């Protein structure tokens, strides 16, 4: 019984880490404007929101308006972060045990490509993540939750989406995989913000949520397609 193929893999929050450092920013920023907020609220609500979405938050749970240079602030602040973006612990690891053990594996992210490629090289994982790196340009901007972008990476790998697994940390990027009909193991690596938790990936479909990369290819080596310990 070999379930799986070849191994899809979402890029923030799985394979790199910059959720943590953009809520670090958003921190800083409104801090030294008045407001003190958690790093957990800030992922929580800010992450992904537009933002006029974020000054509505504001208006609406801190019963707080920025000073009118907060857009200029916060653009040149997001910048000069996009430097420390850094590995998740232990996906280098795991993308050199994927390669020498000759799985096919891609990434697919709803990041700007350009960005997606900044990400790969500022956290030292260009070489390892190989050739397979698909953003939602690839798929007419029509990027996850749809499932294009993880039917289009598997077809590129020359596998049916129905025999890859996708590892995901948020909903957005898990209904992507089995929209796609892929199998979804979620990925939760503990010290990192994720869009998503435990329990919503269950209830979504995850048939198991994981919590380190060396659960992950411990999993992967359950599964056939890594050695066992
Ligand atoms: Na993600």
């Not at 938050?57 to 308006?65: E, G, N, R, S, T």
């Not at 090289?121 to 007419?140: F, K, N, Q």
């Not at 919503?200 to 995850?206: C, D, E, N, T, W």
Request: hydrophobic share 45%; with cysteine.
């Amino acid at each position: 019984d070999a379930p799986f193929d070849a191994v899809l893999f979402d890029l923030d929050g799985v394979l790199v880490e910059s959720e943590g450092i953009i809520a670090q920013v958003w921190q800083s920023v409104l801090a030294e404007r008045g407001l003190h907020l958690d790093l957990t609220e800030i992922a929580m609500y800010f992450t992904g929101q537009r933002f006029d979405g974020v000054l509505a938050y504001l208006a609406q749970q801190h019963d707080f308006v920025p000073p009118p240079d907060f857009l200029d602030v916060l653009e040149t602040r997001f910048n000069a972060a996009m430097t420390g973006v850094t590995a998740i612990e232990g996906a280098a690891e795991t993308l050199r045990a994927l390669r020498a053990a000759g799985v096919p594996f891609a990434i697919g992210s709803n990041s700007e490509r350009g960005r997606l490629h900044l990400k790969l090289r500022v956290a030292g994982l260009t070489e390892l993540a190989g050739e397979h790196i698909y953003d939602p340009s690839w798929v007419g901007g029509r990027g996850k939750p749809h499932p294009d972008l993880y039917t289009f990476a598997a077809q590129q790998l020359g596998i049916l989406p129905e025999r890859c697994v996708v590892i995901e940390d948020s909903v957005t990027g898990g209904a992507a995989g089995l929209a796609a009909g892929a199998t979804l193991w979620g990925l939760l690596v503990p010290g990192h913000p994720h869009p998503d938790g435990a329990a919503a990936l269950s209830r979504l479909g995850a048939a198991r949520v994981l919590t380190s990369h060396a659960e992950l290819r411990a999993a992967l080596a359950e599964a056939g397609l890594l050695t066992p310990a």
